[PDB]
């Protein structure tokens, strides 16, 4: 409540500029801030990645160990995603989205992580750790999680399943989160821009540009007109971010 005073004035500013068709830092309404992906940042981890989205920082680590195959899928691997935003409800929504995008795009062939039909199956733990929250930890974590899985090494030797091999990854889930303000949208909102409210839309695309997951959040009404425009711009934005994994 005492923090709100500074934020509210920051809100007036972001709106003062929105009326004049601009953002605080000069970006375009569909422009992400500089993205930096750094894999293998946690050696003891089977896979890992640090992603920087503007000043926003997040690190994802992956751990693999055998064990529990779900009763309904005793022949399908397992992927668990968790996040820590050092509230709970948010940290939970963040983990679920990242997970949905990985799950629905089938980025990781869960059938290949089988070891013993319904007895032992590889279990992939994806843990998201936020370091610096400067806005849109969601996209950063999504970029970091897929980047981490792509740079993951199955710990076969350490156990008894033979030679170690890279985790078979077949898709590249990416998500664009936009801050909706009235009938205007702002892709990749910064912490400052969020001072307007927590009204956002998140679209997740796969290799082929198929929408794999969508999530609208906040106490706001989403104009269907804007949603259509944002649906297009978003698939585009995800594609351009996807070529950041190429080089």
């Amino acid at each position: 409540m005492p923090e709100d005073i500074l934020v509210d004035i920051k809100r007036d500013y972001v709106l003062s500029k929105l009326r004049d068709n601009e953002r605080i830092d000069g970006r375009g309404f569909d422009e992400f801030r500089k993205v930096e992906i750094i894999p293998n940042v946690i050696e003891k981890a089977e896979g890992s990645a640090l992603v920087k989205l503007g000043d926003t920082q997040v690190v994802v680590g992956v751990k693999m160990q055998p064990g529990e195959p779900y009763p309904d899928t005793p022949d399908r691997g397992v992927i668990i995603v968790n996040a820590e935003l050092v509230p709970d409800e948010n940290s939970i929504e963040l983990a679920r989205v990242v997970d949905r995008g990985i799950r629905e795009s089938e980025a990781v062939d869960l059938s290949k992580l089988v070891i013993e039909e319904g007895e032992k199956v590889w279990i992939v733990f994806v843990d998201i750790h936020a370091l610096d929250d400067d806005g849109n930890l969601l996209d950063a974590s999504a970029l970091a999680a897929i980047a981490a899985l792509m740079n993951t090494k199955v710990p076969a030797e350490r156990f008894d399943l033979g030679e170690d091999y890279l985790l078979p990854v077949r898709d590249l889930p990416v998500s664009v989160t936009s801050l909706i303000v009235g009938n205007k949208y702002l892709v990749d909102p910064s912490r400052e821009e969020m001072s307007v409210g927590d009204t956002t839309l998140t679209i997740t695309t796969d290799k082929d540009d198929n929408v794999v997951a969508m999530q609208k959040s906040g106490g706001y009404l989403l104009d269907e007109k804007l949603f259509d425009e944002l649906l297009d711009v978003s698939i585009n934005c995800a594609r351009k971010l996807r070529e950041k994994f190429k080089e």
Binding site: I92, S105, N210, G219
Partner: protein, 245 residues
């Protein structure tokens, strides 16, 4: 197995046909507003506890009422008895469900107060999330809390490559996508989306076609919603002439 055989889903419904719905307002005596709703195998019950005082003073708001929404599944609502209490899924559904009404309720009329929505799924099938929202919107009107309009909700699935309205358990477990929607109905017409969520794989085109399929279903559901409140209107009406009679 096979989801669509000769234009008919595994229950006889067409790609654009809702499941049998039922709606009843004022079903709970101890509650400012309530509503029993059914959507296919889904049996849901919403309760609303009007603009009251939020007791733990810290969660109070000096300009508007806070809205709380609790989506809970009974341990006997699913196929395999589910341990009672908040699930991560439940927490999620409660967060988004509360966000759909936060935009609709005129919470600014009741500062420092709280309007709590409680929805309980006694029997679960696919779509309970949308059933509860429909059920809650009725209960909110029954409770008479000011709103910009109604909240109607439906999910659009996708089976065997074909978009379907109001998906059932099997089309939700074996389909290629599921997309719950909730719209604000104002003046008998879809105006905006209150709740949008999707999981699966759909093309940019299919998403747009799915919005359409859903708005058709919402108007259909909204009608059942006005009907249920109409009966209520009669009850409180012929109830006044009751004491006079």
């Amino acid at each position: 197995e096979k989801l669509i055989v000769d234009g008919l889903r595994l229950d006889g419904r067409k790609f654009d046909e809702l499941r049998p719905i039922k709606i009843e307002a004022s079903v709970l005596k101890r509650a400012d507003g309530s509503c029993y709703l059914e959507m296919g195998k889904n049996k849901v019950i919403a309760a609303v506890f009007g603009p009251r005082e939020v007791h733990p003073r810290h969660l109070q708001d000096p300009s508007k009422a806070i809205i709380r929404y609790r989506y809970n599944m009974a341990p006997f609502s699913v196929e395999e008895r589910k341990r009672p209490g908040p699930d991560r899924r439940s927490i999620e559904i409660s967060k988004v469900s509360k966000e759909a009404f936060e935009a609709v309720i005129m919470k600014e009329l009741f500062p420092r107060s709280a309007i709590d929505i409680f929805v309980e799924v006694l029997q679960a099938d696919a779509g309970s999330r949308t059933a509860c929202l429909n059920a809650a919107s009725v209960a909110l009107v029954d409770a008479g809390v000011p709103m910009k309009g109604m909240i109607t909700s439906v999910a659009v699935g996708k089976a065997d490559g074909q978009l379907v309205l109001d998906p059932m358990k099997e089309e939700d477990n074996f389909g290629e996508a599921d997309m719950p929607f909730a719209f604000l109905i104002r003046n008998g017409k879809i105006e905006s989306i209150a709740l949008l969520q999707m999981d699966g794989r759909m093309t940019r085109d299919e998403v747009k076609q799915a919005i359409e399929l859903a708005k058709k279903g919402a108007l259909q559901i909204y009608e059942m919603q006005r009907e249920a409140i109409l009966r209520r209107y009669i009850e409180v009406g012929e109830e006044m002439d009751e004491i006079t009679e």
